[PDB]
RNA sequence: AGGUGGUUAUAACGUUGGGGAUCCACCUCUUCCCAUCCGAACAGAGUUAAGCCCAACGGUGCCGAUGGUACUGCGCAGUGGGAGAGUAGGACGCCGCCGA
RNA sequence: GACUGGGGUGGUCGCCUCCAAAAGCGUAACGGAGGCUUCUAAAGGUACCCUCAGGCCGAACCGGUCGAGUGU
RNA sequence: UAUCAUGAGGUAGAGCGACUGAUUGGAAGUCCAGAUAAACUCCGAAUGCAUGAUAAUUGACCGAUGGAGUGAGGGCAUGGGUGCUAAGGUCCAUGUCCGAGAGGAGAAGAAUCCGGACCACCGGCUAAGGUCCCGAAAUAAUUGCUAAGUUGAAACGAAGUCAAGAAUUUUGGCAUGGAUAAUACACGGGCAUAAGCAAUUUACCGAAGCCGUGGGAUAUA
């Protein structure tokens, strides 16, 4: 699981999400990666099914950067619980996107399989992506 | 299951009473507070509770001096 | 710490309390290690309107200040108030605010 | 100088301080013309009313 | 590493005018720096083949047809969180004095280098 | 340990309540606090 | 070259260099005023090194546009308001009173 | 006895503080977190005098540069 | 109610070597670089609020007294909590309508769009929405697109077609496959290749809204 150790809370409210990502949206660190198109909250079990499918590829060469971290906890109620009576039992992190936000990067890698291991972890998450590249990349490395 | 909360206590309607700009009498009470979130300056008093009051009539100042401290005064005559 | 702060803070607990306007102006005293100086603010305008100085010394300072209250009573201040300005009220301080006392200077 | 007010839409599912306008104005009726000098606080009313008057 | 670019002076100022200009396929500019004051311009998405690009291409001699013309280098580029168009361009002026700071590529153990116009102060790219 | 004592030792008479912490002080509190008869007098507790 | 104020540090901190018939400060001595284990501070009866003052430095801190963008009122993207951050840059104070 | 996403079971019932609360005040839920049913003869009043807490250096102690306490 | 003037905010947003708690690389500290928050803040709006002065405007704001009813609410929009970012769900806040509200369009619908019914009239103008027939008014004019009778739900695939580009490739318009159960089925129906979709212009239809004519009633002057 991919979750923080400690919070200072166990429960939190649903908030709203609102936009479009002011920071977090051009690519640092590295070449080519994947911009998000939808709000949607992000499960940990969906970022390491994306993480291990761009890294099956690619054989093991270059970097792979995932930008997000899912730090906020759900619950959910259970069978043949009524409304009200408090919160549900503990379900998990998720982390909270909006559109224009980079999940995943990745570098030291040829651009025409670059392209094809993105769009393989991208298959894999609950949100419609877009693939960008750097502003100063040439086609000769 | 059940729930460990529930528990709440009366709002104690703090805040400006009289703004920067009115008239205020002898005894009018200014400002309602939690500490000196504003201080006493010219012809106003503070009480047990840090509540502003007007020690003469006159019409209510407020201003802003180093490390953006706010004071209340009465401007009379 | 050194006396320069620790004097300032001193000051800044005094002018807490004591101010001067155009009737009961404030007295301050200068003590150096010679020589010793009076003076007499009105807090409102910023306007000193009596002075006095040197240019054992407990005399000396008895005697600057019957001549700063004399200056109080030839500029017509029939009341006043006196801060300790840093210094403790012991020895040319006490001297000086009794030889004031002693003189004119209503206070 | 005097300036031409026609109200040309209907008050019903408008906000009360929208009608108060409209009643501060003068206006009382569809199609009621109302003449007023183009001070300040007039062309701030009608501001406030736009999307229901007509300068006429 | 000399370019040379065109454009036209701006009027309207606000976000209505800005969508306008965007909309009419061109970005806002500005062009500040040195003493005295700076200018407000349009440039064209087609006209800029500046930021697109792989070598550095300092030097962008400017032509403001409500001004004289002038040499500046990329001092802040603003683009659209999610279509990653550019919307702003911001342009620093560069005089012989007080030489200007530079990002410049590296080799392998080699730069662009840059003299003139900028005399020194360089600080990196791309150190991997 | 908390207790409420009087001061006594008029003048009608001339109270005043008070609380005290007996463990902390087993002695008998002495203060002069007033009469409304006259003026200021020594009171003491136990009523 | 001191004291005493009004201006929310554009006023603060720092570095480097310059200062003495007297202005301040360090400086000798504790008998009485007073005082702490300690005259270090509080209390009294040779100096410019340092405090202090002067100057140069944009260094550490402060201030900070224009443009754009976020957000937002109007029950509509038409009509109004408009940041934060950042980037240019500004800045090593200013207005009094008494004294010599 | 009442409340109660039917009732029962469980939980709760007065007061204080924060968030829910939408930048005046006010504002609900079996919404999210905690506390109280006291204490001090000084831990009250006043005059005077002091300044925490932490990091490095040297061996409870000497010196130089930027959160602690306030009974609960 | 509006305008102007003055005043206090800590929400949206933003930012966190400006704190607290999380987080990412880093090269237990430290340096550099990502990034996060209802119970974080070095910052910080738009609206809202208070006071005063003007303007317009009703008229009903305030006191004191006679008489009450209500104290089961509901839908929609916005800001939220809860729930599963489910419910014609539930709990608050700001508006609005149904309740207590008729008339017009949507085939037929409590609260979606237009619009507040004193009475009469075989008069006229409009609103939303419309003008081939059922059914009032254009088989009006001009310019394009669609060939699916589309018309009057998504990941994901060819790209059928038009258009605009750049160095294969992007970009939008309209279509197409994905597309699915039980009494007989739908653009309301006929039917339409425009009578579909997009744009513009002019006429016209269209309500218990407005005007006209006749007749009453209730108040303020
Ligand atoms: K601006
Ligand atoms: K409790
Ligand atoms: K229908
Ligand atoms: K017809
Ligand atoms: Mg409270
Ligand atoms: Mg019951
Ligand atoms: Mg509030
Ligand atoms: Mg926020
Ligand atoms: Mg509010
Ligand atoms: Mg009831
Ligand atoms: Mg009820
Ligand atoms: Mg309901
Ligand atoms: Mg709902
Ligand atoms: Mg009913
Ligand atoms: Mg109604
Ligand atoms: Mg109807
Ligand atoms: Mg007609
Ligand atoms: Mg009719
Ligand atoms: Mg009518
Ligand atoms: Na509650
Ligand atoms: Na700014
Ligand atoms: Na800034």
């Given at each position: 699981?991919?979750?923080?150790?400690?919070?200072?809370?166990?429960?939190?409210?649903?908030?709203?999400?609102?936009?479009?990502?002011?920071?977090?949206?051009?690519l640092?660190?590295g070449s080519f990666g994947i911009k998000?198109?939808?709000?949607?909250?992000?499960?940990?079990?969906?970022?390491?099914?994306?993480?291990?499918?761009?890294?099956?590829?690619?054989?093991?060469?270059?970097?792979?950067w995932?930008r997000?971290?899912?730090?906020?906890?759900?619950?959910?109620?259970?069978?043949?619980?009524?409304?009200?009576?408090?919160?549900?039992?503990?379900?998990?992190?998720?982390?909270?996107?909006?559109?224009?936000?980079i999940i995943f990067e990745v570098?030291?890698?040829?651009?025409?399989?670059?392209?094809?291991?993105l769009?393989?972890?991208?298959?894999?998450?609950?949100?419609?992506?877009?693939f960008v590249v750097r502003?100063?990349?040439?086609?000769?490395? | 299951?059940?729930?460990?909360?529930?528990?709440?206590?009366?709002?104690?309607?703090?805040?400006?009473?009289?703004?920067?700009?009115?008239?205020?009498?002898?005894?009018?009470?200014?400002?309602?507070?939690?500490?000196?979130?504003?201080?006493?300056?010219?012809?106003?008093?503070?009480?047990?509770?840090?509540?502003?009051?007007?020690?003469?009539?006159?019409?209510?100042?407020?201003?802003?001096?180093?490390?953006?401290?706010?004071?209340?005064?009465?401007?009379?005559? | 710490?050194?006396?320069?702060?620790?004097?300032?803070?001193?000051?800044?607990?005094?002018?807490?309390?004591?101010?001067?306007?155009?009737?009961?102006?404030?007295?301050?005293?200068?003590?150096?290690?010679?020589?010793?100086?009076?003076?007499?603010?009105?807090?409102?305008?910023?306007?000193?309107?009596?002075?006095?100085?040197?240019?054992?010394?407990?005399?000396?300072?008895?005697?600057?200040?019957?001549?700063?209250?004399?200056?109080?009573?030839?500029?017509?201040?029939?009341?006043?108030?006196?801060?300790?300005?840093?210094?403790?009220?012991?020895?040319?301080?006490?001297?000086?605010?009794?030889?004031?006392?002693?003189?004119?200077?209503?206070? | 100088?005097?300036?031409?007010?026609?109200?040309?839409?209907?008050?019903?599912?408008?906000?009360?301080?929208?009608?108060?306008?409209?009643?501060?104005?003068?206006?009382?009726?569809?199609?009621?013309?109302?003449?007023?000098?183009?001070?300040?606080?007039?062309?701030?009313?009608?501001?406030?009313?736009?999307?229901?008057?007509?300068?006429? | 590493?000399?370019?040379?670019?065109?454009?036209?002076?701006?009027?309207?100022?606000?976000?209505?005018?800005?969508?306008?200009?965007?909309?009419?396929?061109?970005?806002?500019?500005?062009?500040?720096?040195?003493?005295?004051?700076?200018?407000?311009?349009?440039?064209?998405?087609?006209?800029?083949?500046?930021?697109?690009?792989?070598?550095?291409?300092?030097?962008?001699?400017?032509?403001?047809?409500?001004?004289?013309?002038?040499?500046?280098?990329?001092?802040?580029?603003?683009?659209?969180?999610?279509?990653?168009?550019?919307?702003?361009?911001?342009?620093?002026?560069?005089?012989?004095?007080?030489?200007?700071?530079?990002?410049?590529?590296?080799?392998?153990?080699?730069?662009?280098?840059?003299?003139?116009?900028?005399?020194?102060?360089?600080?990196?790219?791309?150190?991997? | 340990?908390?207790?409420?004592?009087?001061?006594?030792?008029?003048?009608?008479?001339?109270?005043?309540?008070?609380?005290?912490?007996?463990?902390?002080?087993?002695?008998?509190?002495?203060?002069?606090?007033?009469?409304?008869?006259?003026?200021?007098?020594?009171?003491?507790?136990?009523?």
């Amino acid at each position: 699981m991919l979750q923080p150790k400690k919070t200072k809370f166990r429960r939190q409210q649903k908030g709203r999400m609102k936009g479009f990502a002011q920071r977090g949206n051009q690519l640092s660190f590295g070449s080519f990666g994947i911009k998000s198109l939808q709000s949607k909250w992000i499960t940990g079990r969906q970022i390491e099914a994306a993480r291990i499918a761009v890294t099956r590829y690619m054989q093991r060469q270059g970097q792979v950067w995932v930008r997000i971290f899912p730090d906020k906890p759900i619950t959910k109620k259970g069978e043949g619980v009524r409304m009200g009576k408090g919160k549900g039992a503990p379900e998990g992190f998720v982390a909270p996107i909006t559109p224009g936000r980079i999940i995943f990067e990745v570098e030291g890698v040829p651009y025409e399989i670059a392209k094809e291991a993105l769009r393989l972890a991208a298959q894999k998450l609950p949100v419609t992506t877009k693939f960008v590249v750097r502003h100063d990349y040439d086609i000769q490395n | 299951g059940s729930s460990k909360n529930g528990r709440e206590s009366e709002s104690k309607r703090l805040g400006v009473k009289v703004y920067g700009g009115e008239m205020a009498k002898a005894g009018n009470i200014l400002v309602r507070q939690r500490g000196t979130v504003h201080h006493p300056g010219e012809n106003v008093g503070i009480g047990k509770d840090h509540t502003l009051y007007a020690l003469k009539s006159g019409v209510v100042v407020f201003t802003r001096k180093k490390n953006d401290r706010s004071y209340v005064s009465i401007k009379t005559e | 710490v050194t006396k320069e702060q620790r004097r300032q803070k001193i000051k800044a607990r005094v002018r807490g309390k004591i101010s001067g306007t155009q009737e009961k102006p404030r007295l301050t005293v200068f003590r150096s290690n010679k020589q010793i100086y009076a003076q007499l603010i009105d807090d409102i305008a910023g306007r000193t309107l009596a002075s006095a100085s040197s240019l054992s010394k407990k005399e000396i300072a008895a005697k600057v200040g019957d001549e700063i209250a004399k200056a109080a009573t030839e500029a017509g201040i029939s009341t006043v108030v006196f801060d300790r300005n840093g210094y403790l009220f012991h020895g040319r301080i006490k001297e000086l605010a009794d030889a004031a006392r002693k003189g004119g200077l209503k206070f | 100088a005097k300036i031409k007010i026609q109200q040309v839409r209907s008050r019903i599912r408008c906000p009360k301080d929208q009608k108060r306008t409209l009643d501060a104005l003068g206006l009382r009726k569809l199609n009621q013309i109302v003449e007023h000098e183009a001070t300040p606080s007039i062309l701030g009313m009608v501001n406030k009313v736009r999307h229901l008057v007509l300068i006429v | 590493k000399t370019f040379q670019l065109t454009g036209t002076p701006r009027a309207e100022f606000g976000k209505k005018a800005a969508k306008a200009i965007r909309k009419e396929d061109q970005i806002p500019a500005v062009l500040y720096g040195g003493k005295g004051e700076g200018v407000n311009f349009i440039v064209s998405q087609d006209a800029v083949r500046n930021l697109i690009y792989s070598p550095e291409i300092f030097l962008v001699e400017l032509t403001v047809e409500g001004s004289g013309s002038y040499k500046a280098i990329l001092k802040e580029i603003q683009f659209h969180p999610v279509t990653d168009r550019i919307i702003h361009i911001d342009f620093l002026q560069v005089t012989d004095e007080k030489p200007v700071v530079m990002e410049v590529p590296v080799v392998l153990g080699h730069a662009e280098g840059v003299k003139a116009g900028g005399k020194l102060s360089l600080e990196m790219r791309k150190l991997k | 340990l908390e207790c409420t004592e009087h001061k006594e030792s008029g003048m009608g008479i001339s109270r005043y309540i008070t609380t005290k912490n007996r463990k902390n002080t087993t002695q008998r509190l002495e203060l002069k606090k007033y009469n409304p008869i006259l003026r200021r007098m020594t009171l003491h507790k136990e009523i």
